[PDB]
Amino acid sequence: GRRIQGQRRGRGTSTFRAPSHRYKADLEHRKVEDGDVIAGTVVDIEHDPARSAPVAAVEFEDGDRRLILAPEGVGVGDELQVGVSAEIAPGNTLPLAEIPEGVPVCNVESSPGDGGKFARASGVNAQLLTHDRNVAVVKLPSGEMKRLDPQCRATIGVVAGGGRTDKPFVKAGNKHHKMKARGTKWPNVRGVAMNAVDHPFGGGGRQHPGKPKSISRNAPPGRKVGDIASKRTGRGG
Template sequence: MKKITSNEPIKMLQQHLAKIHEKRPLLKKGLTGIQKSTGRNNSGKITIRHKGGGHKKRYRTINFLRTQNSEGIVCTIEYDPCRNANIASIYDFEEGKFYYILAPEKLSIGDVVKSGRKAEPKIGHSLPISKIPVGSYIHNIAPKKEKKAQISRAAGTFSRLTEKTLNYAKIELSSGKQRFLSAKCLATIGIVSNELSFLFPLKKAGQSRWLNKRPSVRGVAMNPVDHPHGGGEGKKSGKGKTLWGKSTKNGKIRKKFLVKKNPND
């Protein structure tokens, strides 16, 4: 595909892109293979239980670092097997290349998206937080300047910009937690797509095996040598212990970080 200049009309290209099939991946070069870890570390020991199997899939390389000033058009909105959100393929007018981004809600084929300091605060545009109005919904947020986006990337998640100064900004995550970031950090306008993904239950046990999830056996169904809850006539209740005998009741959910006092004060 030849390089398109910004002076050429976009309407003809938008009509052509509306006919592209969405089920097959558009970018063949953006696909890479994934080696299954099955919950094991580099020494082969299981660190995450109930993982194994899973359908064979290829990873779509997503552009989480949209710092350069660029302008592109949405070619397709595709399904990604490695995440619960949809992705969108973008054709960059300046570089003449394709790349994938996380597709926000209300982003359709043929829309023009921009990134960098010259971008306007519109859906799908990536720009510094200092140029985003207070109260806007944002996603795909970088925790530090010139770093890849790591915050609010799952389907249906978002953050809200509550306060902003010349140097810092305060955002509220969808969980209610608040974070302080640099105003130079980049974020994308909008809410991540496929927000109703949690409403579709698994129709059979085999779907969990496709998703690399192995079954979890209840402790009361085991023998006494296998679990503290095992054995006995009937079900045991009130023990509340893990497989290794640690209590699951009245445990600390969150670590309390102690602030060291300045001895000079």
């Protein structure tokens, strides 16, 4: 047959690539040595084309104009502090050890000094729970208990732009516009609507899948379609 759509994806052609040249900033945490004497004023609130949520333009004490991942309730004029001895206020970045338990946090690092990996999408947050000399247990937006190094930096507050998922797209045109700003080929043609040559579920006199949809983990690319290694399917039971 012919390579399926998921295989054409990896080749990284124009149709599948993100419009990186139209993107603003790689929202990472600032590099401080030790001292905390790094603070800044918020100059503007901009729209980030990569995440459909707002991003705050901050100017630091040493004269560095950088775009930071904006939490909720951060405006122009507000002072934000980045460092170890930083104030426990919304919009400030300090390591998980210094942040008190039961406080909603965002833009959490995986390995200390990476710049933030977890809890970055609109309105989400990570919950800091347990403290130790060795480990800081953070509850990620999926409900998972992630055991992290207490030296991993994070910004206090929930991410801005909450409730985005609440309003429906209503029409295909609105989806079109959102998708033109992402690294995704859209619209989606069902495999069941294709020819046998194009997809494992293609073919037939009527539209139905060939074999069952739940595919093994060990399945090769070109066959791994439908429900990938499903523990279960359906709603009931």
